Amino acid sequence: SLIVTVTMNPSIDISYLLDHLKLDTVNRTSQVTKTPGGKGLNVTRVIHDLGGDVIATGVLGGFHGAFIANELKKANIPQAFTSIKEETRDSIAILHEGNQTEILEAGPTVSPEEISNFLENFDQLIKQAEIVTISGSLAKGLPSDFYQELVQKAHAQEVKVLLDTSGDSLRQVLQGPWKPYLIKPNLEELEGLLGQDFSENPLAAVQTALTKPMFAGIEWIVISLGKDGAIAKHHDQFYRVKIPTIQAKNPVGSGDATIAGLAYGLAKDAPAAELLKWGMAAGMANAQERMTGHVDVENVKKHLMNIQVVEIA
Template structure:
């Protein structure tokens, strides 16, 4: 079973407007409300692909109840830790070809609630083969909390796919136990290393990924947007090239990439197949209006058209 972790879920609210009028009333009858958060995007895509998945994390208040109900409606298994404070809203206003976002910071999770979640997480590890950790931590959590989850999973020999950034990622990399995979995009890698990279000089990215900081991580997949990806598996490097597609909504494509990899890993796919399925899932998500969804038929079509080449060193 794949367990997905979302430590700061939200209700994602989308308001499409022809024109956003400032300092007056705006009306719309096309409101969309979905269970959001990077980890829940991962969950839905694994579910769409037919994978055995369970969502966990923390949920609170009426918003938390809404999120749980939305997952239940589509038959997604879940085991969240309840918290006292209200889960957050993330608002997107779509107007004149732009997307203006208003993101709440979210709840503060108490020390007792953190302990309760960690105990539940250790129980879920008994049933899991793969864990995905995605996105930010809610307020209250120490910055090394994800490192703690990686360590607990390693003790049970459960593979962790980590998709976070900033200090949370730095703390994970400092840990004695390493995740099985990390998936920074180019901007996140630059932020992590304090170094700029160019798509014209991929050898510089290769050299960066060979640094001692990344030692012990089996897989590093650096997503390059429409340019595909560069990946490191053990000591080998791969260049992944993807075909051009008509993009409808790119939000959640990085989460879908993690979902595709987790699903492929659960199906015991080989190196080339794993790189194809993760990129195919990301592409298929970008073709959907709804964030964190894929059509398995599109995934399979993209899978056939993605090129993976081993980079000779």
Template sequence: MVLTVTMNPAVDISYSLTEFVLDTVNRADDVTKTPGGKGLNVTRILSELGEDVMATGLIGGKPGLFLQEKLTQADIHHHFFPIQGETRNCIAILHEGLQTEILESGPVIKSGEAESFLQHFNRLCRPFDVITISGSLPEGIDSDYYVKLVRLVNGYQKKAVLDCSGAALTEVLKSADKPYVIKPNLEELSQLVSQPVTADSQVLKKLLCHPIFEGISWVIVSLGSSGAFAKHGHTFYRVKIPKIEAVNPVGSGDATVAGIASALLHGLSDAELLKRANVLGMLNAQEKVTGHVNLADYDKLFKQVHVEEV
């Protein structure tokens, strides 16, 4: 079973426009409203894979109720912790092949709520085999909060897959409590090692031996349309993917996390894990709706992904 954690979820609102013009009225051709936030994208894709998954995190207000109702309608299990603040809305305007986003920062979490969620999480996570922790922390929560979540996961000898960036990720990597998997992109990797980073295999191989990554079983570096580079233990892999027609790449990293969690759950080989993760990322990019995959092309793409040990 997989538990997904989204500390700062959102109602994702997508407006499709033929043309977006400033300082005038714009009428949307199509509108979608879905449960959003990186962890909930992971949740949906795991559900579409047929995995036993539950979502948790912080929710509040009418947007929070909407979010829960939509998950229930999709037969997705959830057990959120209620807060006094209101779950945020995040707006994406799709226009002329571009995407303009307007993201609310979200509620300010009270210290008592943050502490109570740790207790809630501690009770909740015990039966799960893999726990994914995704996205930003809302205001009011200290940057070392994910350290506490990872510590609880490790205490039950479960596997934590952490997908975050900035201070929250740095705090975890500085701590003694390491997640099982992290999934930085090149920009995030550059920030972690405080130097420019290229996609060259030898450069990445050297960088992933940096002391900051010690104790982490899997470091999977997303290279976007160029695939991925990964380190598992002392073994390094280059992942090459086919060219695809991307419709909406938003959420592809979350689809990749879903693939990692699913592969860990089923004990797949290194190559199979990397293939599943990358195929799901590509399938998400081919869909209009964020956090959704059409599995009809899964096998075809799986055969086109090449994993090489380097």
């Protein structure tokens, strides 16, 4: 069943491997990777790797956008981005001595007319979809509540929204009458929403938090806890998800991978326990890969066997 991903501020992700980062001087390297990035494209790639039926949308501009579209084509990832005039952004990640120093650009400005063009395209794509993922930053020009329009449209088409987003904005979706099917805030995200501190006995705190009016009407809530696995709520059932303590190279985007695994599970009508395993197993496989937004499916399937899902009273 068709999953649509949304990436409103896609990036050429540039990754530099450096022995040492010498400040105020020239650092040379031939250890460079340039990859389609932004959270929604990390998601897209993982779903694609899992064998899911995905199409990527969002906005792409200029030669940078054309580079991304061509990379997606070479990978045989179905895409249906909307064109904009301004250039798609670059993101820089510098890897040096265990450090990850990053530079994020604000990105291009999208015009009201381009926003209208994207929404028309979004309307057509979601007619054929079962699931939509919405995550990541908004390009400039987009109204701070852009994602709520997207949730409302999916609702009219009876499409399940996986919303992996944060802050004041996520709060405004949750405040409104059109609920996402699934949300996946991390602990700091959740602390931000509730204006609450969960540093002491986080597991017990999260279980209380998820009973709050904030979260009413959301079918699935999945809170990743890193090595502690997850706490989740489906309607009135709380779950604890316990995962093996694995050797975890690059954690960047294991959260985009979790969402991909969750979308993939939903797409195949996985029961609750299985759905939570696809999520955790994808996040796990991703962390064992240098490439962000990439898993090997055989290793995912392996991790599925060693995750425990526990119903909490």
